[PDB]
């Protein structure tokens, strides 16, 4: 009755990937919700594996390099994340998905690095308004949360400056292993790199013209044709329209409806190959109290879908009956 | 030019079906709106038939029984509603639809009971995020608004405890006469009962995959194949997304857009078989002032659609002409 | 790489077309946004051509006539607008689109009059919840913003009262040159006139049943079958759902999503025939501060789409390279 009967949960409160304080509170926003209770009610055993502690150096220890802000905090955090994720995914070798709540999206370099150590043939589905694939010299902002894929993609390595402390961050993805859904705010150089290297991508224009059902099918066909590969689902909450997820740092109008977001997660979950899902860029310090509740709510529905929640209902584990309790039914009485 | 040239309007301010105070104000929220004026502007004669007074016993007279809260208030209210609705529907035997504004959804047991006395072969279209079909021993909350269909469905009667005061509540529906649209939060035992007894149901997943146009067609095909039966349309305002109907007691994200809600009502109206439409679960005491206005607005658009309002326009009853008033037109002047 | 490499921008702060103060601030709402910057970032040279000064007479000089409010302010403003637009469109005879920001929708009589002087064979795509085609004796409100097309449509001229000061407002459109998208609140007499004279129209019902992709295609087929004609795109911000454009004077629920609005503008832009786009009915004095930001944001996305912005990305004008700066890449280092 369940594709996944257990799962692990991990918080990664990254906040040095971008300048707005508050992504560090994303994991708590989910823990304070009814997520755990709802997952248990569906028959899934979810273990809270705690939080990764990011490395947050001071300004003096971590000056700008190649325009990148907090790049040594990033490289050290990346290795610490990768070790923890690798360990969890290997203890897991019905499989046991790992649910990761961020934290800004810079955590993805580490989560995918560690995941790939455990599952080298994985594919990545990146759900985001943005490409998050800027190389350091092309980034206008120097914010690491806009660069996490660039360090992982083998075809991009001639455009990444060498730094000694980045050595352990080995590019573990081919361009052919990634597919985007939800894009609507790409930087020019991202557009160039995505098209040059043939990365599968489905922008909001494609979703409008094709419909989300065909988009999901084509994205899975592009990177996981026969469902042979483990799936790393990297979900930026800002992929969803700001009407349903306002509390995030770089909101862009015209995003996925919650329903469209649910359909992506339902289909990925149903492959039986969901290995890691991470949800990035929750920021409970942004927007009104009601904005935060809407965003928390959307996130909870999304994550539950990833774990197998069905909108069309679940059957009871045990079917209750009146006679058992010694109670008289209307039907019995009429007889 | 009109499928329905007259209609009746009835308020049922039920509030003992669920614990949040304020559903009793639903009928006034519609009367205070421009609904009546707009319906008249479409050429429909709408008669306000007043309000049913619910029976609201005190705690001492109405203790919990089989976990149900306010079950004797419910049984007495149900019979009082059924008598009034039966009387109105028989005085009506182009037909004259009855528009009912609630009130929490527990009123439906009474409205359908009385409707079926006048029209025994009716079908029911239940538009709701929820199944409202819990039997009393399976209800986690004991709230009657989550159980109204269970008492009506013949196939369920071995799961309903006998109570003397429920005797006059005779099951008048077969499972084959009901179809749901909009479901996204079913309890496990509801899911079990719906599937076991073959009740037609179209959840938000079905709406996503099939599109609302096909869903409406399939729902009508399932319970009213050749448009031979009178239609009881039971519309829970919470079927609509909380972005358009926030002021309701059990809001669930990812609901029908207003447009999708309009399409259901337009198609049902256009069958010529709309006999009763009820709109349940408005609660003007929930949310901000603007939340209440949004919810009132959505409700008014929905109800107008049920009565035949066309978004593509209506023709004037009399076409005005310049010469008639002795006025010179530009065309006339140029000649 | 660009269909349009330059464009002109003009503000028309009309506010005598309707009673709510604030449409006069629409052009500033766009100038205060990041619109200009974003358009430049796409490689388009946009020239701000300033604002037209509307003629605003006093009550004594401009009494009601045929029930019309401020009709002489309207006729004088119309001629002043038409002269300015004609001059700009002729200096422009890759073409150079003119972007016009209003201002209430009464400005359209002038913008289309002047546009047609420069391009007599134009077609009009009118994106609006409303018909804006009431003739003066049928208007319930006497607000000119609800009548701008009636003065332009040749087939309607026997229903327009003659006024000497309207003489220079020559009907320059055939009914066959106009198509509506987005309608959901037509007056009865508008409905009558649209159907009688065969004006192509796609209401929200049509958008629901056909989908926006087919609607856009059919609208262009109806008025511009082989893309031979210049396009005047008249976009009332109230065509969009009040959830995305709340700050406008006559909001109607159940409108176009931003995405649907974007698709209209993208397809019109891509014809290469976009000659004028005007955006009407922004009112920054309506709604909360956040309402105004949402409305400004929607307007900016819409206008950028009209000018060729692609949600699927743009390529860089110059591709940056590491070696050029004398920087060592990871790939280089490994070798
Ligand atoms: N492309 C921009 C925005 C990055 C957005 C980061 B993301 O998708 O995690 O929110 C940048 O490089 O700064
Ligand atoms: N299934 C829940 C919720 C019922 C919701 C009631 B309704 O759809 O009228 O809002 C219960 O039995 O308590
Ligand atoms: N049909 C109404 C409303 C007009 C709406 C004007 B428009 O579309 O510019 O907002 C009237 O004549 O007053
Ligand atoms: Mn993003
Ligand atoms: Mn991201
Ligand atoms: Mn409900
Ligand atoms: Mn209900
Ligand atoms: Mn309008
Ligand atoms: Mn308009």
Automatic annotation (TrEMBL), chains A, B, C:
InterPro entries: Arginase (IPR014033), Ureohydrolase (IPR006035), Ureohydrolase_dom_sf (IPR023696), Ureohydrolase_Mn_BS (IPR020855). Its EC number is 3.5.3.1. It catalyses: L-arginine + H2O = urea + L-ornithine. GO terms for biological process: arginine metabolic process; urea cycle. It holds the Pfam family Arginase. Mn(2+) 2 binds at residues 128, 130, 236, 238. This is Arginase. It comes from Schistosoma mansoni (Blood fluke). The lineage of its organism: Eukaryota, Metazoa, Spiralia, Lophotrochozoa, Platyhelminthes.
